Structures are given as structure tokens and as C-alpha cells.
């Protein structure tokens with residue numbers, strides 16, 4: 455998160471910290487959010503050979519009793535996810551067992567301001583953050599994201615005032631974008647120089663597919 459503040463620890467009990475395993479390189483990291491005791495929503499491009507989920511975390515380098523490190527049994531990436539257009543950047547993770555409900559861990563059931571949180575990098579050349587950072591971003595008209603050639607208003611949200619530095623960035627993918635407390639978007643992609651706006655998956659469009667996956671599993 456660029457241009458944000460450190461969250462009050464555990465003020466966002468649904469936040470999930472993802473460690474992703476591939477076969478040809480070291481681990482990668484994304485965010486995500488617990489929508490069912492055993493289901494975590496994140497970005498399609500965070501998929502890997504295997505994934506571990508830590509719930510209840512603030513400072514991700516210091517273990518604490520709030521922590522729930524959970525195994526992912528199955529990854530449900532959207533079937534139509536496109537590595538060329540980046541369309542349908544969305545994935546459901548099924549946890550091996552249902553998470554415990556605690557104070558620190560629980561499910562989450564243009565021109566306006568939304569908020570987005572993550573453990574991602576705090577600047578173009580900065581490392582990922584140790585602690586959960588958040589930032590408030592402006593929801594933009596779709597023409598503000600026209601320069602992303604495959605951006606699609608129906609599928610995506612355009613997020614972030616270009617006059618401001620604030621933004622999600624690497625490591626923040628899969629995190630929820632909340633407007634008035636409700637999840638509206640998912641961190642997906644943007645420019646490598648982090649100049650806003652950036653592109654978020656529009657959750658509402660994928661709601662049928664989401665419900666589909668839940669009931670079948």
C-alpha cells in the first residue's frame with residue numbers, strides 16, 4: 455500500500471495474508487479476504503502450486519495467538535481468467551478446515567471514497583510491509599482508466615485519483631476494496647510506476663460465479 459497508514463491491529467479481521475508456492479521460484483505473497491469460515495476470496499493471478507493462508511495477522515513477522523495459519527485444500531480460479539487481457543482476475547480458496555471465529559478473525563458478509571488494505575510494498579522500490587497498511591482511494595469514472603487498453607467498465611473498477619500518490623501495489627493483489635464497509639472490488643493491477651488509477655475486479659459482476667462455487671463445494 456502506497457501513501458497509507460498502518461491499520462489498528464486486527465481492525466480488519468477478515469484480512470488474509472497469502473503465501474503462494476510455485477515450482478520454479480521462491481514464494482510469492484498476496485492479500486485476500488475471508489468470506490466464509492472456509493472460503494477466502496483473492497485474485498486469479500495469485501494462483502500457484504500450493505497456498506498457505508494466515509488469518510489474524512497484523513505484523514506478519516511476529517507470531518501471535520491471533521494467528522491462524524490455514525492450509526488451502528483447493529484453488530478455484532475463474533475459468534476465463536486471461537493472462538493477456540487480465541480479465542476476470544478472481545479466485546476462491548477453499549480452506550482445509552473452517553477458521554475459528556475470534557476477535558481478530560471473522561468473515562466479511564464515481565467520486566465516492568473506498569478503502570483498501572494490504573501487506574504489499576509501500577513504494578515502487580520498497581519491500582513489502584511488515585504490518586497491515588490501508589489507504590483511502592477515490593472511485594473514478596471509467597475514462598480515467600482508458601489507457602489500460604483492456605480495462606472494461608462492466609468487469610472492473612477504476613480506482614485512485616491521479617493527482618494523489620495513494621495506491622495499492624505489488625503484494626496487495628487479491629485484497630478487498632471496501633466502500634461503506636462492503637467489498638466492492640479486488641486489487642488486480644496497475645502501472646509499474648504506481649501512478650494511479652489502478653484496476654480492481656468488480657465483485658458484483660462475478661457474484662453468480664462466486665455463489666456457484668460456494669454451493670458446489
Ligand SMILES: *[C@@H]1O[C@H](CO)[C@@H](O)[C@H](O)[C@H]1NC(C)=O
Nearest residue numbers: 460513514515516517584585
Ligand atoms: C514488526 O516486528 C518485528 C519484530 O518481530 C520488528 O522488528 C518490526 O520493527 C515490527 N514492525 C512494527 C512496525 O511493528
Ligand SMILES: O=C1Cc2ccc(Cl)cc2N1
Nearest residue numbers: 622623624643644646652
Ligand atoms: O493497485 C495495484 C496493484 C498492483 C500490482 C502490481 C503493479 Cl505493477 C501495480 C499495481 N497496482
Ligand SMILES: [Zn+2]
Nearest residue numbers: 463512518520
Ligand atoms: Zn495482536
